[PDB]
Short mmCIF file of C-alpha atoms and ligand atoms in Angstrom, two decimals:
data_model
loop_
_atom_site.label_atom_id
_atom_site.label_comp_id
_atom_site.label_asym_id
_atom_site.label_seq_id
_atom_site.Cartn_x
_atom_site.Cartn_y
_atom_site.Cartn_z
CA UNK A 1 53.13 -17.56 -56.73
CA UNK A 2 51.75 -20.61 -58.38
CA UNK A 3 47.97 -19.75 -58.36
CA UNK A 4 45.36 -22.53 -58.22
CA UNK A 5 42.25 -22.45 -60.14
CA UNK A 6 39.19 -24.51 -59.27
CA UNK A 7 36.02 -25.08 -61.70
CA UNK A 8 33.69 -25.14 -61.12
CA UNK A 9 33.26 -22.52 -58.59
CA UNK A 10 30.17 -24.41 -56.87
CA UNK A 11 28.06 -27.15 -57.97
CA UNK A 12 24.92 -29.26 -56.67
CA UNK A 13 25.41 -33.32 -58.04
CA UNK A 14 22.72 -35.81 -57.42
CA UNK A 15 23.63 -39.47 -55.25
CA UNK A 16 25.75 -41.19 -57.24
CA UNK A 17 26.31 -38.87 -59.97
CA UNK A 18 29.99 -38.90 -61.08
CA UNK A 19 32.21 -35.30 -60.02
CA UNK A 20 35.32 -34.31 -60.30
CA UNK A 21 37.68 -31.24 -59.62
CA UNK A 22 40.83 -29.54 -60.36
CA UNK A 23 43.22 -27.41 -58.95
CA UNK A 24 44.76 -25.61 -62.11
CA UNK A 25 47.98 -24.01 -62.12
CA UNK A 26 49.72 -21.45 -63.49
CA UNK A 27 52.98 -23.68 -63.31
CA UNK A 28 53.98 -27.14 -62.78
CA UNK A 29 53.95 -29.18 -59.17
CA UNK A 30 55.32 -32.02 -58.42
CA UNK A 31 51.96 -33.30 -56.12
CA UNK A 32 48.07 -32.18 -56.37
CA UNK A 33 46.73 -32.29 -52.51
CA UNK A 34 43.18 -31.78 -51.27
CA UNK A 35 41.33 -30.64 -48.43
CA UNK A 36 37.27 -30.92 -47.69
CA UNK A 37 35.93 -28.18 -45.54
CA UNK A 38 32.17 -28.46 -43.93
CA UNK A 39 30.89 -25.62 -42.29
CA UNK A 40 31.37 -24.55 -38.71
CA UNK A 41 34.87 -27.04 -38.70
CA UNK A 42 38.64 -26.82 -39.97
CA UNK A 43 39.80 -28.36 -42.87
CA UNK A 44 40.74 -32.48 -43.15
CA UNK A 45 43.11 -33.64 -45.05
CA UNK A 46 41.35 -35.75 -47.76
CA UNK A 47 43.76 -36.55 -51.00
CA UNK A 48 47.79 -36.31 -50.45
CA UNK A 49 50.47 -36.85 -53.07
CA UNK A 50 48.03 -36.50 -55.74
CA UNK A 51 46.27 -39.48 -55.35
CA UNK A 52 46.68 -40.79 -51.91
CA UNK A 53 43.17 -40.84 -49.89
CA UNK A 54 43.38 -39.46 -46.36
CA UNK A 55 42.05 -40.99 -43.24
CA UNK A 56 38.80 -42.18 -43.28
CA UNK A 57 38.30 -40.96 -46.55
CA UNK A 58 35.73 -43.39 -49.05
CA UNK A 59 37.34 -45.56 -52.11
CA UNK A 60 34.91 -43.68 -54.09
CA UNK A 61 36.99 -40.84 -53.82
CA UNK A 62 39.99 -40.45 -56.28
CA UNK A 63 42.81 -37.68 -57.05
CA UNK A 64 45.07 -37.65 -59.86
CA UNK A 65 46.50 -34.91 -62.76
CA UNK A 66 49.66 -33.55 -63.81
CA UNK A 67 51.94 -30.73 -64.06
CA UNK A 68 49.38 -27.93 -64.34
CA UNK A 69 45.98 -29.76 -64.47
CA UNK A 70 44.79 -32.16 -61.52
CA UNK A 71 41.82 -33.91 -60.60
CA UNK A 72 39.50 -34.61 -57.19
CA UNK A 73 36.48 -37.75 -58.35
CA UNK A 74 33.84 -38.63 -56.61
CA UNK A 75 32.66 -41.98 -58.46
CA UNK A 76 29.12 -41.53 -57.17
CA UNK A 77 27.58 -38.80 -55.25
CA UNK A 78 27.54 -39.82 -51.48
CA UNK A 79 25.56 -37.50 -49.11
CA UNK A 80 28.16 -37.49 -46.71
CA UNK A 81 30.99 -36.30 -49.47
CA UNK A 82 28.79 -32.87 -49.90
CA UNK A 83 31.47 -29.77 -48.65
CA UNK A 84 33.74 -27.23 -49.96
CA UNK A 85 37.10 -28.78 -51.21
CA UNK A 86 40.28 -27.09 -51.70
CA UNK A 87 43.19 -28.52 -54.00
CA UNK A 88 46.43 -27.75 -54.09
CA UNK A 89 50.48 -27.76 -54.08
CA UNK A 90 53.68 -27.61 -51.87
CA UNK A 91 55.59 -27.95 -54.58
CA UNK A 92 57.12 -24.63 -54.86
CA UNK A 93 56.83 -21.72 -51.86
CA UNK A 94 55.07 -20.01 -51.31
CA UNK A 95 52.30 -22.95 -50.58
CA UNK A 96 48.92 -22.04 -52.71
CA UNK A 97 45.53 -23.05 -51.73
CA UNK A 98 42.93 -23.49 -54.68
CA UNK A 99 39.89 -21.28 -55.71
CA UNK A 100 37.69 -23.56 -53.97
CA UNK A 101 34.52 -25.59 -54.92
CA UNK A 102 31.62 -25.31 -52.93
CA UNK A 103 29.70 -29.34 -53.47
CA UNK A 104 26.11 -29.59 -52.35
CA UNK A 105 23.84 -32.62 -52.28
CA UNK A 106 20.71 -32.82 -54.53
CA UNK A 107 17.88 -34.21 -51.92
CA UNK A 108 14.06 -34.29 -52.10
CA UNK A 109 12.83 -31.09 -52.30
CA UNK A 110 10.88 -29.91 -48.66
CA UNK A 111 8.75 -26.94 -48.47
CA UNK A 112 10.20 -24.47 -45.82
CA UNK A 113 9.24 -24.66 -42.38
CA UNK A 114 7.88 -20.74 -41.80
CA UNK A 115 8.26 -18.97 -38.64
CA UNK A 116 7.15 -15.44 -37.22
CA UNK A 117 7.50 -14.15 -34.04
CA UNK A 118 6.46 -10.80 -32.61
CA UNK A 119 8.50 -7.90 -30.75
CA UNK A 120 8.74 -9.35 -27.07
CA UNK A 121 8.20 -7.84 -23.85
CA UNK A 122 12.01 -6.83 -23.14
CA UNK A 123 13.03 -5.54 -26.29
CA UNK A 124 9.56 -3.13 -27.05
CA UNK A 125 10.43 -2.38 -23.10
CA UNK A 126 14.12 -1.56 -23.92
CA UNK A 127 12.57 0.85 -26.26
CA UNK A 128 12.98 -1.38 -29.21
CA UNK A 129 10.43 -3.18 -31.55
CA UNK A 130 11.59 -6.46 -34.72
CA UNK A 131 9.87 -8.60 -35.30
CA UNK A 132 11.68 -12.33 -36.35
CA UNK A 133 10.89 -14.94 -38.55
CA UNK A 134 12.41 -18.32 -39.38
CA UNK A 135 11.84 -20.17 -43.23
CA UNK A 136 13.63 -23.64 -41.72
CA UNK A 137 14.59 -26.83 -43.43
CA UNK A 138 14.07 -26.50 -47.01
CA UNK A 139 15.60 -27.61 -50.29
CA UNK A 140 17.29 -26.13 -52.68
CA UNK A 141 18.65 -22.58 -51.39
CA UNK A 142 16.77 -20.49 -53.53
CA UNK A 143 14.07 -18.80 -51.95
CA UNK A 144 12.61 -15.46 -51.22
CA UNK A 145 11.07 -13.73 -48.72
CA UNK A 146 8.72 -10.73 -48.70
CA UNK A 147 7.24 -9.12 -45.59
CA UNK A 148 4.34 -7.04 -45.33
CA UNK A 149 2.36 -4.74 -42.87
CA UNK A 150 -1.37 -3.91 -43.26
CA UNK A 151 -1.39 -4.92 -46.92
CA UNK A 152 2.08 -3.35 -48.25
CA UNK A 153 4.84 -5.42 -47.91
CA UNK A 154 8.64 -4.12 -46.99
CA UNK A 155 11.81 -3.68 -48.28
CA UNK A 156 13.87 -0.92 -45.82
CA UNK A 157 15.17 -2.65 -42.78
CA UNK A 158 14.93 -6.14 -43.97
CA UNK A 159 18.04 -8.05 -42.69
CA UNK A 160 18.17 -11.55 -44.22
CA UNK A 161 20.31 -14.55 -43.28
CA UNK A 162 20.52 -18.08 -45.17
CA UNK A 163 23.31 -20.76 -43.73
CA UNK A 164 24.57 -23.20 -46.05
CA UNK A 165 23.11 -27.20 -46.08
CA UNK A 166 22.65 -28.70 -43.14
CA UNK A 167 24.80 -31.76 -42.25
CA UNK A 168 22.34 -33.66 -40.55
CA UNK A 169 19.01 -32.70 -43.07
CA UNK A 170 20.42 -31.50 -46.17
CA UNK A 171 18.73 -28.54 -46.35
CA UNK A 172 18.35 -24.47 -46.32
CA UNK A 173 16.79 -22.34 -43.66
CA UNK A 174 17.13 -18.34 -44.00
CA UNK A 175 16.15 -15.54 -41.54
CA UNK A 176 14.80 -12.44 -42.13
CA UNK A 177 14.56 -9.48 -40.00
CA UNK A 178 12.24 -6.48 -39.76
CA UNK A 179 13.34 -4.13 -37.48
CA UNK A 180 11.28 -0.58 -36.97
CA UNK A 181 11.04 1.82 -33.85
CA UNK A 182 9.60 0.96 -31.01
CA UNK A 183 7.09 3.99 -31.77
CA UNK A 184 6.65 2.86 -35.25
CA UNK A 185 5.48 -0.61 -34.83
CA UNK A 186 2.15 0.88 -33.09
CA UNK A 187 1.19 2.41 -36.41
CA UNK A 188 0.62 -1.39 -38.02
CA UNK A 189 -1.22 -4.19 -36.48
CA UNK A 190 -0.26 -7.39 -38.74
CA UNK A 191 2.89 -8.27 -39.73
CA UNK A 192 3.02 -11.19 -42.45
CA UNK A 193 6.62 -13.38 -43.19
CA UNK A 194 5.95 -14.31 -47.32
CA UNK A 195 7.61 -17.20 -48.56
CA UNK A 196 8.64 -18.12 -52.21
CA UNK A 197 9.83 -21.59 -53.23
CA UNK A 198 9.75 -23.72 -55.63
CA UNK A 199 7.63 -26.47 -53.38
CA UNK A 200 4.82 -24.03 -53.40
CA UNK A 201 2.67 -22.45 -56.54
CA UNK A 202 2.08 -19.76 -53.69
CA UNK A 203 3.84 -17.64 -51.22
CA UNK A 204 3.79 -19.47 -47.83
CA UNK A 205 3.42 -17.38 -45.25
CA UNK A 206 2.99 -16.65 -41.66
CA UNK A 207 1.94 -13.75 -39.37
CA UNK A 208 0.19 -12.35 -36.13
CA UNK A 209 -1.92 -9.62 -34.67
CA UNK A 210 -0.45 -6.77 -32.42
CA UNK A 211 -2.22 -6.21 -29.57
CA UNK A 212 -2.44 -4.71 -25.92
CA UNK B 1 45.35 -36.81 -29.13
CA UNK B 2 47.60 -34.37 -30.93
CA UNK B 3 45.80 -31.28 -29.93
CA UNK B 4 46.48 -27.54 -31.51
CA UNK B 5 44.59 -24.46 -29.75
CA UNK B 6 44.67 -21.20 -31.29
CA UNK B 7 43.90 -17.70 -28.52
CA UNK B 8 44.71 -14.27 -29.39
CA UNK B 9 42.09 -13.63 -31.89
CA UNK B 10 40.30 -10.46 -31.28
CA UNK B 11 39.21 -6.92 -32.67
CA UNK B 12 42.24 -4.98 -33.67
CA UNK B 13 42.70 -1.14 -34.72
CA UNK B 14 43.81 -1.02 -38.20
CA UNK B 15 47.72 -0.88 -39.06
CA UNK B 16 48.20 -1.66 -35.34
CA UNK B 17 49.21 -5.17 -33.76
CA UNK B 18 48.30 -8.34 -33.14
CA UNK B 19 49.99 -11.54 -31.75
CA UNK B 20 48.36 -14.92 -32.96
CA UNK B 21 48.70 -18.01 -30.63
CA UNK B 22 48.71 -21.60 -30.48
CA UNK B 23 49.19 -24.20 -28.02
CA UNK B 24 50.31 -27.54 -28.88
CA UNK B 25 49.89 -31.03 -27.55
CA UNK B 26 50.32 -34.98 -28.21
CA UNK B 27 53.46 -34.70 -30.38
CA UNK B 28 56.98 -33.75 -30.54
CA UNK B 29 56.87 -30.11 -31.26
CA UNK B 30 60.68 -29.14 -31.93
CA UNK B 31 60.07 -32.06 -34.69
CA UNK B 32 57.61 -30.71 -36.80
CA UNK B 33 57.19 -28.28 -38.80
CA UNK B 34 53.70 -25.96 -38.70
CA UNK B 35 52.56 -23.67 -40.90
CA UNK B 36 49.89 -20.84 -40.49
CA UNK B 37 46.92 -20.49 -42.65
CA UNK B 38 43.96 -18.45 -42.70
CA UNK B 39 40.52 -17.91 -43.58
CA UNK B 40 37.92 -15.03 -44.19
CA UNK B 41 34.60 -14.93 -44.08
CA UNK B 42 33.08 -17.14 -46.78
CA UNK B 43 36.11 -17.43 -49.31
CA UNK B 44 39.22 -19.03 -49.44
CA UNK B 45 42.13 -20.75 -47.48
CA UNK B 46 45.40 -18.36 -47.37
CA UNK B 47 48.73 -19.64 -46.65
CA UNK B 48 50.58 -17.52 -44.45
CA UNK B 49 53.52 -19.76 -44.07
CA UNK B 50 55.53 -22.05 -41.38
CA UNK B 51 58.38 -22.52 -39.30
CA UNK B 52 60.78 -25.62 -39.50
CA UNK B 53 62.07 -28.00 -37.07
CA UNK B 54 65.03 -28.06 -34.94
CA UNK B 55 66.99 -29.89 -37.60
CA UNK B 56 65.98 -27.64 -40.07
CA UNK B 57 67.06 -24.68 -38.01
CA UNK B 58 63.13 -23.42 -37.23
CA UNK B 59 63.94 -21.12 -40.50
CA UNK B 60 60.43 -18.90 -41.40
CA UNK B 61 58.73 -19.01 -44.55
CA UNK B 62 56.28 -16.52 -45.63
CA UNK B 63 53.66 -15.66 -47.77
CA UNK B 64 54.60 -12.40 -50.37
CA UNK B 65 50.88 -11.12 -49.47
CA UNK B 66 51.98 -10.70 -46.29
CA UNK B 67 55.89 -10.70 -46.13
CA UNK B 68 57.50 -7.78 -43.83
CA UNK B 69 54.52 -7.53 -42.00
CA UNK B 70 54.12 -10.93 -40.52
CA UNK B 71 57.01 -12.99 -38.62
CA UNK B 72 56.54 -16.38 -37.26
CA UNK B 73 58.12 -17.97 -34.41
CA UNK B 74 58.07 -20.24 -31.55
CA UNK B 75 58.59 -21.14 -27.61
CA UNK B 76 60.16 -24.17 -28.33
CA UNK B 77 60.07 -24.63 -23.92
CA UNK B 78 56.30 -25.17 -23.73
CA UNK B 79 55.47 -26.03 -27.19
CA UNK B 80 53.72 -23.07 -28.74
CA UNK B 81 53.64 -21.20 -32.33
CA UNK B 82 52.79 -17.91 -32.76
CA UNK B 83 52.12 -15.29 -35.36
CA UNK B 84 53.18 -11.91 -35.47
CA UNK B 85 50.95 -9.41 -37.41
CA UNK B 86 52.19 -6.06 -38.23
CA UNK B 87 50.58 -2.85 -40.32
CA UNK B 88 47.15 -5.02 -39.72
CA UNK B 89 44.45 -3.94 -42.37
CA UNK B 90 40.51 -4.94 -42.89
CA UNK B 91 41.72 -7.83 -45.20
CA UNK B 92 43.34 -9.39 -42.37
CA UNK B 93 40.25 -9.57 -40.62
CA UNK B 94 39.77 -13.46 -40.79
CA UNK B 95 40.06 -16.87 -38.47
CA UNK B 96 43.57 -18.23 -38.47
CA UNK B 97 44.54 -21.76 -37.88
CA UNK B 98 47.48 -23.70 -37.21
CA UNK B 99 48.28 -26.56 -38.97
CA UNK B 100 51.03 -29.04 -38.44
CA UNK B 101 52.78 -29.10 -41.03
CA UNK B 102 56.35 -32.30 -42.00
CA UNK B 103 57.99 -33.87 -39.67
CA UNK B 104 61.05 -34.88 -38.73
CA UNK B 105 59.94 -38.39 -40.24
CA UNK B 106 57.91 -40.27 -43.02
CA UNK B 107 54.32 -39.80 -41.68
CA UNK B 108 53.52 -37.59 -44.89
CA UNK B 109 49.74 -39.42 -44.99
CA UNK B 110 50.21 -36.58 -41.84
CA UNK B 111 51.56 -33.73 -42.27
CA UNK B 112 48.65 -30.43 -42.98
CA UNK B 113 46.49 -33.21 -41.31
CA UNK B 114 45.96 -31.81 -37.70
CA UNK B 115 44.68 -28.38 -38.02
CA UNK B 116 43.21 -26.39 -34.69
CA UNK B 117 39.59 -25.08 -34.58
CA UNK B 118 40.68 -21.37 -35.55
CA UNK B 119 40.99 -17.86 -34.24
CA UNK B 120 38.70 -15.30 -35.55
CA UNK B 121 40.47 -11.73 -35.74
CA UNK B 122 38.98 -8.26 -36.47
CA UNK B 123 41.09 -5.38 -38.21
CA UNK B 124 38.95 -2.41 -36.99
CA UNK B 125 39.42 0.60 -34.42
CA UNK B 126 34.77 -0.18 -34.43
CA UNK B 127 33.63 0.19 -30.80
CA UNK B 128 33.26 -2.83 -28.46
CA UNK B 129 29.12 -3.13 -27.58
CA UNK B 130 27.82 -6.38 -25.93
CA UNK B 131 24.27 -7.59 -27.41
CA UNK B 132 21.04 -7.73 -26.30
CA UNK B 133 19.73 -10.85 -26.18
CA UNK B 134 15.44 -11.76 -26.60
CA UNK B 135 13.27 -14.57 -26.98
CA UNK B 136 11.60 -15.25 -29.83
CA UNK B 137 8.22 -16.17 -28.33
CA UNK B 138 5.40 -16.98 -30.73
CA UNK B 139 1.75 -16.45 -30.54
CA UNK B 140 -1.50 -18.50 -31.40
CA UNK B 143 1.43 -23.77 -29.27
CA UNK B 144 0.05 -25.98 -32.59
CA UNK B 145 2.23 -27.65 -34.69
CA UNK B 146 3.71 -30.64 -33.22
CA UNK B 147 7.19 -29.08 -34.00
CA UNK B 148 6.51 -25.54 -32.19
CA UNK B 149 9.66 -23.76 -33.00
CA UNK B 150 11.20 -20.97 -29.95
CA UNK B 151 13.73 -18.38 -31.45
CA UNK B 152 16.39 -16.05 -29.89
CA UNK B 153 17.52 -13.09 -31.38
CA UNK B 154 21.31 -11.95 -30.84
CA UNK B 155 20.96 -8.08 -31.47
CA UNK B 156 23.73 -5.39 -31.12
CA UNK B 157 27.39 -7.05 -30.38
CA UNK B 158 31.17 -6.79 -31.51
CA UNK B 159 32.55 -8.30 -32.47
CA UNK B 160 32.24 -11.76 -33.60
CA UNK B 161 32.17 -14.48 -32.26
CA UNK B 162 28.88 -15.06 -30.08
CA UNK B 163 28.08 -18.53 -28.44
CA UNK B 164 24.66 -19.43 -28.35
CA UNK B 165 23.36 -22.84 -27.52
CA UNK B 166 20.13 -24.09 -25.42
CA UNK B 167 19.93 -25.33 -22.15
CA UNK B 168 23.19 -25.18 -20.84
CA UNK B 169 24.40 -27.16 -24.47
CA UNK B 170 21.74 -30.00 -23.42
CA UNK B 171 19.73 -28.66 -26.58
CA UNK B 172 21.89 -29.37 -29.38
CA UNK B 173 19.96 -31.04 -32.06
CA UNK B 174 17.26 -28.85 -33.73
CA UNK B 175 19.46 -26.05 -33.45
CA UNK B 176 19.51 -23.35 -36.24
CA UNK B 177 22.18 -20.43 -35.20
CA UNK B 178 22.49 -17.99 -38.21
CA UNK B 179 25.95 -16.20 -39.07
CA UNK B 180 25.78 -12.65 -38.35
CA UNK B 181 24.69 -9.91 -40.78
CA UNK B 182 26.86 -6.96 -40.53
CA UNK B 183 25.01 -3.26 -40.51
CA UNK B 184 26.19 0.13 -39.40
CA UNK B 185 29.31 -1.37 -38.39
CA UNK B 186 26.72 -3.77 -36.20
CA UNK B 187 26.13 -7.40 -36.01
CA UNK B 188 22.93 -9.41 -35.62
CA UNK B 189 21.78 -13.24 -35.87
CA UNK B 190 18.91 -15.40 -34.75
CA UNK B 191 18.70 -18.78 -33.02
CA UNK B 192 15.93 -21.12 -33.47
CA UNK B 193 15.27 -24.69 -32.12
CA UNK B 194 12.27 -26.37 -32.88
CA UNK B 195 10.95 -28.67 -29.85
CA UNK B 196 8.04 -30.58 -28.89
CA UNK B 197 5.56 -29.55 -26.42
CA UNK B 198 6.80 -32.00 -23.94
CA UNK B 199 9.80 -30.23 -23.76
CA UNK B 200 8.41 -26.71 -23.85
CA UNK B 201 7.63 -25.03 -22.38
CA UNK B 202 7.18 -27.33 -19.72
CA UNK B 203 10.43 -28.40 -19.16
CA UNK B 204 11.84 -25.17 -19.78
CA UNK B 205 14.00 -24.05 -22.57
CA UNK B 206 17.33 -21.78 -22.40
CA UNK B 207 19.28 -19.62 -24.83
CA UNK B 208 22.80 -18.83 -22.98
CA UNK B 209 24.50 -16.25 -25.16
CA UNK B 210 27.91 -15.40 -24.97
CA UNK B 211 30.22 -12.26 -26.04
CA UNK B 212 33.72 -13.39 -25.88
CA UNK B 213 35.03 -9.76 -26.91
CA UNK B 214 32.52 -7.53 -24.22
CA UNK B 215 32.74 -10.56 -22.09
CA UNK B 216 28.77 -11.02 -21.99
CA UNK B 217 27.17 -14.03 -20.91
CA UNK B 218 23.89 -14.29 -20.88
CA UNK B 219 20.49 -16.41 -20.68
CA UNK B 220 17.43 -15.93 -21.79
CA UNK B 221 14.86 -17.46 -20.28
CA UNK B 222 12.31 -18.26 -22.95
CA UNK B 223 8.90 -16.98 -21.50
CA UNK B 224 5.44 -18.89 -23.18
CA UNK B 225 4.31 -16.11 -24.72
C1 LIG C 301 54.14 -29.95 -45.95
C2 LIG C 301 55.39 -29.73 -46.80
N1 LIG C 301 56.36 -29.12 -46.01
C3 LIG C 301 57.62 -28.81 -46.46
C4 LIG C 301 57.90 -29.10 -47.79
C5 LIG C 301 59.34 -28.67 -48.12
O1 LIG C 301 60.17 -28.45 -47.04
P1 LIG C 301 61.62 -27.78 -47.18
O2 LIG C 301 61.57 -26.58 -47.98
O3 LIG C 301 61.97 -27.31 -45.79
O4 LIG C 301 62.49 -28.95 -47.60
C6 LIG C 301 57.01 -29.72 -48.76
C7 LIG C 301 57.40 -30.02 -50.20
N2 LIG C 301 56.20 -30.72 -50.79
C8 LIG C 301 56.58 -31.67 -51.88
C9 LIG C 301 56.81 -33.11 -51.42
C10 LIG C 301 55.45 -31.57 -52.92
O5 LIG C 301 54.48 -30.77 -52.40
O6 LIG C 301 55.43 -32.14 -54.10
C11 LIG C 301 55.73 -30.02 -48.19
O7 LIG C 301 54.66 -30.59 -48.83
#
């Protein structure tokens, strides 16, 4: 069992701000090799033998180490180098993959894109009643959301449900959802979404108006 | 194009078992080795271990984590791998790819290069329910970017597909992973059009439940 340690655990660098990695062992290998995962796909191949880059993998991008300490650099930050990366050895069996680092890009920050939607027709008719609501493309991650119904806001059956940086934006979106009984919903007329981030000195928010 | 396709992921009752496939394509099979690895749910990769070539006797390695449980093998007549999971538990729940692993030559720049897209598997006796799928309709048509929404409620297990019109909708798209609740999965999609588009020309959500075999479209009302 040669275990692999990564460190740091996650990390958000700036374009072209220098980074690098390691796959730390609790024994010698012969060969450091490195994977870079982005979400929703398998992993590619990105440094072999230590320090050989993969296919269609950027000059800026450099492995190296020895015996129990290795390395993954990225020269300068790149926008299109931001994944999760895994190190590690075949030197011994069992084959070990690394701790993993999770790499994020450091963009312009963009105030969420709130979103609330009310119980529709088929769902309140199925005898249901939640009510969405969307806080798209922003930047960084942290962010919180706070309903609210007729002045108090809500924490029981509050579902939420970030994703991790967009490939093609950069950015965070999350989604929470409010689900109460069909019955209950009747008993409250406006439902607000309440957003907190660090674009806004106040709680962006969005909301409607039951009605029949 | 050296092509790798993993089926046989799917919900499984605990300590029972599950075989793990994986069709091959655009290489010499019987001369190259392929391991197994896995994932779960936001950690990790786990190696689970290969299989060698012909000249290497297709002798199985394993992984101690899961050794006497889990034999690999392979049809070496139509070029397929499997994976052979015993004494299954939770922690096994996870999406499991193959990777081809050394060949019988010096293409080592290869070798753990071509991986497959992953087979998501679910260690749990949990009850099978399709979801119920609803448009997220809003209310009071501004904002140039009007964003629709579709909410995938009360399915399993995982995975869903959801994209808009018949895939034609792909950028914009925001599907959510799944929260899991009372042994129950839910997640949103949102897409954020233009009027022109909607709804005008008419916007779709088709939703699919591989598991409960549910396919279905919503057809998202203005309103
Ligand atoms: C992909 C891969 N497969 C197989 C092996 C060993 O195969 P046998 O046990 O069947 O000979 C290695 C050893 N990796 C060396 C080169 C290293 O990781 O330093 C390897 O990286």
């Amino acid at each position: 069992d040669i275990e692999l340690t990564q460190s740091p655990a996650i990390m958000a660098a700036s374009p072209g701000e220098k980074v690098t990695i390691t796959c730390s062992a609790t024994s010698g290998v012969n060969y450091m090799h490195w994977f870079q995962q982005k979400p929703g796909t398998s992993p590619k191949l990105w440094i072999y033998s230590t320090s050989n880059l993969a296919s269609a993998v950027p000059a800026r991008f450099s492995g190296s180490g020895s015996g129990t300490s290795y390395s993954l650099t990225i020269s300068r930050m790149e926008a299109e180098d931001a994944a999760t990366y895994y190190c590690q050895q075949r030197s011994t069996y069992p084959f070990t993959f690394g701790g993993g680092t999770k790499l994020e890009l450091k963009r312009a920050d963009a105030a969420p894109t709130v979103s609330i939607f009310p119980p529709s027709s088929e769902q309140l008719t199925s005898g249901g009643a939640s009510v969405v609501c969307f806080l798209n493309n922003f930047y960084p991650k942290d962010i919180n959301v706070k309903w609210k119904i007729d002045g108090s806001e809500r924490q029981n059956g509050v579902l939420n449900s970030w994703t991790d940086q967009d490939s093609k934006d950069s950015t965070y979106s999350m989604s929470s959802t409010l689900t109460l009984t069909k019955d209950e919903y009747e008993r409250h007329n406006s439902y607000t979404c309440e957003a907190t981030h660090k674009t806004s000195t106040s709680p962006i928010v969005k909301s409607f108006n039951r009605n029949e | 194009e050296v092509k790798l396709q993993e089926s046989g992921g799917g919900l499984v009752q605990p300590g029972h078992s599950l075989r793990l496939s994986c069709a091959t394509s655009g290489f010499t099979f019987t001369d190259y080795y392929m391991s197994w690895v896995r994932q779960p749910p936001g950690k990790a990769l786990e190696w689970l271990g290969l299989i060698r070539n012909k000249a290497n006797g297709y002798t199985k390695e394993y992984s101690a984590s899961v050794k006497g449980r889990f034999t690999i093998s392979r049809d070496n007549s139509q070029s397929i791998l499997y994976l052979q999971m015993n004494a299954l538990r939770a922690e096994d729940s996870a999406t499991y790819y193959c990777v081809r692993d050394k060949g019988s030559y010096g293409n080592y720049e290869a070798w753990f290069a071509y991986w497959g897209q992953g087979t998501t598997v679910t260690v749990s006796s949990a009850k099978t329910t399709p979801p119920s799928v609803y448009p997220l309709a809003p209310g009071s048509q501004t904002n140039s970017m009007v964003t629709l929404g579709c909410l995938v409620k009360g399915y399993f297990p995982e995975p869903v597909t959801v994209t808009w019109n018949s895939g034609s909708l792909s950028s914009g798209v925001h599907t959510f992973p799944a929260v899991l609740q009372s042994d129950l999965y839910t997640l949103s999609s949102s897409v954020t059009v233009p009027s022109s588009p909607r709804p005008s020309e008419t916007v779709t959500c088709n939703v699919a439940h591989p598991a409960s075999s549910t396919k279905v479209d919503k057809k998202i009302v203005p309103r």
